[PDB]
Amino acid sequence: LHKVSVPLVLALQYFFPIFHWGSDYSLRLLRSDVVSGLTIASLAIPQGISYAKLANLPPIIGLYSSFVPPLIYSLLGSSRDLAVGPVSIASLVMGSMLRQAVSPDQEPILYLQLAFTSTFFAGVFQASLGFLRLGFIVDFLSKATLTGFMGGAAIIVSLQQLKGLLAWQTILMGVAFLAVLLTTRHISARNPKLFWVSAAAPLTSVIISTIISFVSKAHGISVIGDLPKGLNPPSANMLTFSGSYVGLALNTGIMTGILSLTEGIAVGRTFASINNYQVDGNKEMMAIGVMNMAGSCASCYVTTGSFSRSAVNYSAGCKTAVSNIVMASAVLVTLLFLMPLFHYTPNVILSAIIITAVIGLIDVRGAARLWKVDKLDFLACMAAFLGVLLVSVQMGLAIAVGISLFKILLQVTRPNMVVKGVVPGTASYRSMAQYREAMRVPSFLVVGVESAIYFANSMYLGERIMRFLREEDERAAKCNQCPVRCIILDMSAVAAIDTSGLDALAELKKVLEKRNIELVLANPVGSVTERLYNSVVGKTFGSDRVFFSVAEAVAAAPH
Amino acid sequence: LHKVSVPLVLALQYFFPIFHWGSDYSLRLLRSDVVSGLTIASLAIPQGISYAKLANLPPIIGLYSSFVPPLIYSLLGSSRDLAVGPVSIASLVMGSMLRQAVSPDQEPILYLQLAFTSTFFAGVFQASLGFLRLGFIVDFLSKATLTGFMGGAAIIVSLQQLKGLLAWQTILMGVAFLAVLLTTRHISARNPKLFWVSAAAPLTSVIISTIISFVSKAHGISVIGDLPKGLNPPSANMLTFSGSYVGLALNTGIMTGILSLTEGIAVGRTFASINNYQVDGNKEMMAIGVMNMAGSCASCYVTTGSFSRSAVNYSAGCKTAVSNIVMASAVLVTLLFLMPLFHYTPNVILSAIIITAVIGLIDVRGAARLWKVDKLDFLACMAAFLGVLLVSVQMGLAIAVGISLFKILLQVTRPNMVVKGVVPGTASYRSMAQYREAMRVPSFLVVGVESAIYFANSMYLGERIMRFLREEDERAAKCNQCPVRCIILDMSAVAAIDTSGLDALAELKKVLEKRNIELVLANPVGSVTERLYNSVVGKTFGSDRVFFSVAEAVAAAPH
């Protein structure tokens, strides 16, 4: 028999990780972060400007958002491969939530007061979700939920940019560079060695088209024009905590503060497992969020770790988070010296960078792939696609997160319970539905409940055991066999058990004792055994009714 | 090696179960249901009248509710021991939700139009929750939630009956029969053979006090007075589906239709396991709910299977649901002939039957017992106690059910993952925290995840395996041992797995292959093996990477 057991220097290093990994910084790591930082401050200048236009902001707000939030994260960040900048989904939702209350064309100054207050309210939401150690609710945002959302929100932006839109080389320069940017993101999606042609394609589209426009003073082509040369102007005089639009700037902060958090705490997770290092998650949510609310005071909008630039970062050989300093050192140059060179860049070119980032969100293949595999993840993909397209954008991320949390509760409530039997030649007791080889011991009924025993199922697992008990007490009467005299609960799959779960196991042990059947638990789990040996309802089982395995509960014969 | 496998006559019998169990009805079963039905139409007449006063209704509405809803359930019910009548918690919440919008004393006719419309809206909520096969959400109502609720709502009724209250034998007859009714429910709570003294004590209190009042024309004692002799008057002309109070009569229906359903689908569950028969649950929720909305048209209020009378039913020897006919045959007699005998029964006597049923709801011992065992079930008990006492009664059953559903999600997200080792002399691989005897195999790392692998945890189980992998690859360098060359996932406790869970197991198999570590699954569960052999992401594991047990995965040596 086997017994069942029970189970100021630090202040600038617990808050600022740059004093920890700054000790191992070589010049071989500076050669690797300069190449991967100048590769990444070549996808940041054209796509930061582009995603600021997608958020209906001035195009320099995306370049302000590639200087100070990359510098703040390099002080507070825990990931070596994460790249900080404006993000295509956070810009598309911010520019759709603020478009329908404040017009960006007629009220410009009021529009650059709710883009900065929403960034602050996204900052104080992300920071006060990792400070309260409450970051696991960004894992409730499934990949199926973010397929109908990004795709149900990529249409209502395409509809809003279809009402306000109503020459000829404007059409041809917007469709030629839509064929340079769409086939090249297909070349790099196939071969993961030609990443460099898609990292260079937005900057080459900006550079080449500016030549075909200075060479014309091309009329029939709009042009960015003069952009204000200099660093970030001090905001937080544009942070409106009082007025009519403080519930709109708050609704955009808890909306672009979630979608920016399911991208930055999902790309710091991706590259921590490839390169084998430890990222905290909650300290990463305090980093992205002090980044936002201190960038909100420096004329930036919502930034996080982008999916696209971080993959370019870990394809050019980044080693530390100094690739976010070399990024913000070629953004510092272009904010101080290279600003008159955007005077002839057309708006249709960085409208094509928007289109490849919008139709790169409409993923219909993986939404149809979500129908062949699961069907409650297809319901969550179509409750976000049809909850954003018809009803507001808040209730498309609430009726799809709520029914993704429901399919978890639909398995904890009403779980699978199986009748197990011994596999011949083996002391292992597997289920008798799977494993047709498994035959049953004559005077025993091995039942395995495959979930944690909570309040939500503890009365269902008492009416299912007795349905199992009624069937085998009637099958043994049709086959000249002995009745059930020991019910063994295989607790191998019981994750946890609460006070309503232990009480249902003691109101089952004494109901089965009146019919002389002797309930016995076998193979408990740690966090259940310490719940069973530290309770007054766990001494009604004791040491004679808790066993090492099912084969040891059969061999002891509790009768 | 062992292979892992994959897993009009009926129309009046599917709707009316009385045509099924009416075939075996003997006269020995009629002798047993008459004694247990007249025992139970002796606790129904005094406590039905009493709980109608607790709901601020006329006292005959509780006797109308003991005639037709017992007769409807005897046609549609599936439980042999369930007793149908008015219920102390459903009457206390109905009489508290309608008291604060409509005064029962100044607007009597409007008050007997929202007690009948709430019963209809409780009926169409209970019936259209078992017709949609949606009855598992009454299991979300924990026993900890219904301890702070019944006890946080038993005070705000005691407060409402303290404002409107502001002779001498009225005080003495209300305190003497409060000592006959409170000590006798303590005698029967100790010895479960003297149930008959607590079943007789409300009727004896009504009978004896009526003698001490006819013998006086006792002034200084209020008296029920003349009650309308006859059967149930036809309502549904008092069912108001249009007006100002249709959102109040609906709020009371989804509130007294839940609390009446967590008592009737919890006392038909209790007595189905003691007497070993099968109750459907959803067909039981269609029975209780056609019972309510067809009793609502016959001048009844919310009835269900009461906890107290069903225990008296299964202590006097009920065998079928004809104890609900003998109950409604001694209510038919007292509604037709014995109505002038309540002309001198004092209102303070059946106010004492209320008090023993209100302070029998305030269970402070099991609320303090909920602190020694769990602490997220004490939070749900004090979010219902302080969510009903301060904020409305809807948000005390919403912020306590919502944080009882949260502790389920707080275990599916972030579960327990253990490192397992072989117990010596045994081919069983238990965890190494519990079971200090368990030592590890040199070139292996057996990890057991103790939950279902969902979207909510699939990225947490990839950063915890590599934390387990980083520790044992560093411990083996401090002890002159071989590194980890096979990671075995013990899937013994994995209940289910979704498409985000299989994809995380294939984006872990190929990350571990680059470091030459060869991830292997062992002991899968049926509903995971059929999810793994019917997926394109389950053929990247195959038959060489899915094993019978952990000891067979070690013995095969996948390297």
CB atoms within 10 A of CB A301: 29
Distance from CA of B239 to the nearest CA of A (A): 33
Phi, psi of A308 (to 5 degrees): -80, -45
CA distance B370 to B147: 10
Q: Do A499 and B377 touch (CB under 8 A)?
A: yes
Report residue A524 as tokens: 């408990």
The rounded distance, in Å, linking the Cα atoms of A433 and B55 is 52
Q: Concatenate the DSSP letters of all residues of B168-233 into one string.
A: -HHHHHHHHHHHHTTSHHHHHHH-TT-THHHHHHHHHHHHHHHHHHHTTT-TTS--------SS--
Partner residue facing B5 (CB), from A435, A467, A498 = A435
Q: Which two tokens stand for residue B248?
A: 């109040």
Please state, in angstroms and rounded to a whole number, the distance separating the CA atoms of residues B131 and B286. Answer: 6
Q: Which of B134, B273, B474 to mutate to test the interface with A (most CBs of A within 10 A)?
A: B273
In chain B, residues with a C-beta closer than 8 Å to the C-beta of A494 are 493
Cα(B242)–Cα(A103) distance, rounded to whole angstroms? 42
Contacts of residue B114, defined as CB under 8 A and 6 or more positions apart, other chains included, come to B98, B102, B240, B245, B248, B249, B252
B402, B137 Cβ separation under 8 angstroms: no
Beta strands at B520-522 and B486-490: parallel, antiparallel or unpaired: parallel
- Determine the Cα–Cα distance for residues A509 and A487; give it in Å rounded to an integer: 10
CA distances from B500 to B91, B504, B506 (A): 47, 6, 10
What are residue B520's DSSP bridge partners? B488
Going across the sheet that includes A429-431, the strands are A429-431, A416-422, A444-450, A486-490, A520-522, A546-547
For residue B474 the two structure tokens come to 């560093």
Q: Do the Cβ atoms of B267 and B378 come closer than 8 Å?
A: no
SS3 string, B274-327, reads HCCCCCCCHHHHHHHHHHHHHHHHHCCCCEEECHHHHHHHCCCCCCCCCHHHHH
Assigned token pair, A58: 């001035």
| Entry resolution (Å) | 2.8
Instruction: Give the alpha-carbon dihedral of B87, B92, B94, B98, to 10 degrees.
Output: 160
Cβ pair B459, B500 in contact under 8 A = no
Identify the burial level of B318 via C-beta atoms within 10 angstroms of its C-beta, where 0-12 means exposed, 13-18 middle and 19 or more buried.
buried
Residues of B in contact with A2 (CB under 8 A): 423, 426
CA distance B431 to B423: 9
| Interface residue B518 vs chain A (CB under 8 A) | no
Instruction: List helix spans (H) across A164-314.
Output: 169-180, 184-190, 196-214, 248-251, 261-264, 270-274, 282-295, 307-313
A289 neighbors A130 (Cβ within 8 angstroms): yes
Select from B534, B543, B7, B495 the least CA-distant residue to A434. B7
Closest by CA to A352, choosing from A40, A57, A49, is A49
Distance from CA of B169 to the nearest CA of A (A): 45
When CB atoms are compared, the residue of B276, B418, B500 closest to A470 is B276
Q: Concatenated DSSP letters for A326-345?
A: HHHHHHHHHTTTSGGGGSS-
Domain with CATH 3.30.750.24 in chain A: 415-556
CA distance A188 to chain B (A): 20
Segment A242-247 long-range contacts (CB within 8 Å, at least 24 positions apart): A245/A101, A245/A102, A245/A110, A245/A113, A245/A114, A246/A117
Nearest to A267 by CA among A234, A303, A309: A309
* Nearest in space to B491 (alpha carbons), one of B452, B455, B517, B530: B452
Residue A65 to residue A84: CA distance in whole angstroms: 9
Q: Which residue of B has its CA nearest to A407?
A: B454
Contact B112, B301 (CB under 8 A): no
CATH number of the structural domain B415-556: 3.30.750.24
Residues 6+ apart with CB under 8 A from A332: A67, A231
Contact A499 B370 (CB under 8 A): yes
Residue B265 to residue B138: CA distance in whole angstroms: 8
Minimal Cβ distance to A499: which of B374, B409, B410:
B374
How many other CB atoms are found less than 10 A from the CB of residue A439?
12
Q: What is the DSSP letter of A453?
A: B
**Interface residue A1 vs chain B (CB under 8 A):** no
Identify how many contiguous H helices and E strands chain B contains and give both numbers: 27, 8
Nearest CB to B549 within list A142, A428, A436: A428
How far from chain centre, in Å, is Cα A317?
A: 25
* 3-class SS shares of chain A: helix, strand, coil, % to 5: 50, 5, 45
Q: Which of B116, B80, B470, B127 is nearest to B269 (CA)?
A: B80
Sequence-distant (6+) residues with CB within 8 A of B514 are: none
Residue A237 corresponds to which tokens in the numbers above? 């005089």
Distance of alpha carbon A250 from alpha carbon A257, whole angstroms: 10
**CA–CA distance, A235 with A390 (Å, rounded to integer):** 35
Give the single-character DSSP code of A497. Answer: B
Tokens of A189: 């999606």
Which residues of A, range 391-420, sit inside 8 Å of B by Cβ? 404-405, 407-416, 418
Report d(CA A447, CA A419) in Å as an integer: 5
Quickly count: other Cβ atoms within 10 Å of residue A211's Cβ. 10
Contact yes or no for A434 and B144 at CB 8 A:
no
CA distance B179 to B182: 5
Between CA A141 and CA A234 the distance in angstroms is 34
Task: Supply the angle between the helices B365-372 and B145-163 in degrees, to the nearest 10.
Answer: 150
Both tokens assigned to B133: 């096969």
Using only C-alpha atoms, chain A has a radius of gyration, in whole angstroms, of 30
Measured between CA atoms, the residue of chain B closest to residue A418 is B526
The residue type found at A205 is S
Interface of A with B in 312-341 (CB under 8 A): none
Q: What is the dihedral of CA B513, B518, B524, B529, to 10 degrees?
A: 50
3-state SS assignment for residue B122: helix
Structure tokens at B196: 């008959």
In angstroms and rounded to an integer, the radius of gyration of the C-alpha atoms of chain B is 30
- Nearest CA to B187 out of B176, B207, B201, B205 is that of B201
- With vertex at residue B237, the alpha carbon angle to CA B236 and CA B239, rounded to the nearest 5 degrees, is 55
Nearest chain B residue to A267 by CA: give it: B459
Given a contact cutoff of 8 angstroms between Cβ atoms, the answer to whether A382 and A152 are in contact is no
Question: Using CA atoms, how far apart are residues B294 and B116, in angstroms rounded to an integer?
Answer: 10
State the Cα–Cα distance between residues B55 and B51, nearest whole angstrom. Answer: 6
Contact A497, A525 (CB under 8 A): no
Separation between Cα atoms, residue A71 and residue A325, nearest integer Å: 6
Q: Which amino acid is at A115?
A: A
Q: Which amino acid is at B511?
A: V
Q: Which residues of A481-509 are buried (b: 16+ CB within 10 A; e: fewer)?
A: eebbbbbbbbbbbbbbbbbbbbbbbbbbb
User: Residue B413 is encoded by which pair of tokens?
Assistant: 């997200």
B462 at A interface, C-beta within 8 A: yes
* CB-based contacts of A300, cutoff 8 Å, min separation 6: A61, A64, A65, A68, A69, A119, A232, A292
Rounded Cα gap, residues B31 and B23, in angstroms: 16
Q: How far is residue A555 from each of residues A170, A258, A444, B423, B428, measured CA to CA in Å?
A: 84, 54, 11, 18, 16
Chain B residues near residue A433 by CB distance under 8 angstroms: 7, 526
Contact criterion met (CB < 8 Å) for B143 and A500: yes
Q: Are B356 and B121 in contact (CB under 8 A)?
A: no
| Separation in Å, CA of A15 to nearest CA in chain B | 22
Flag if B452 and A144 touch (Cβ within 8 Å).
no
Angstrom CA distances, A14 to A10, A73, A76, A80, A125, stand at 6, 14, 9, 17, 21
Instruction: Name residue B537's amino acid.
Output: V
Name every chain A residue with its beta carbon within 8 A of the beta carbon of B412: 408, 412
- Rounded to whole angstroms, the Cα distance separating A436 from A420 reads 11
Token couple for B516? 């030459």
Q: What DSSP line would sit under B357-416, residue for residue?
A: HHTTT---HHHHHHHHS-SHHHHHHHHHHHHHSSS-SGGGSSTTTTTHHHHHHHHHSS-E
Chain breaks in chain B (C to N over 2.5 A) after: 7, 166
Test A140 with B413 for CB contact under 8 angstroms.
Answer: yes
Residue type, B75: L
Q: Tell me the three state secondary structure of residue A443.
A: coil
Residue B264's closest CA among B321, B307, B322, B328?
Answer: B307
Cα–Cα distances (Å) from B57 to A251, B50, B120, B197, in that order, read 46, 10, 16, 28
Partner-chain residue, chosen from B370, B467, B493, that has the shortest CB–CB distance to A525:
B493
Task: Note the Cα B131 to chain centre separation in Å.
Answer: 18
Nearest residue, CB atoms, B499 vs list A374, A415, A427: A374
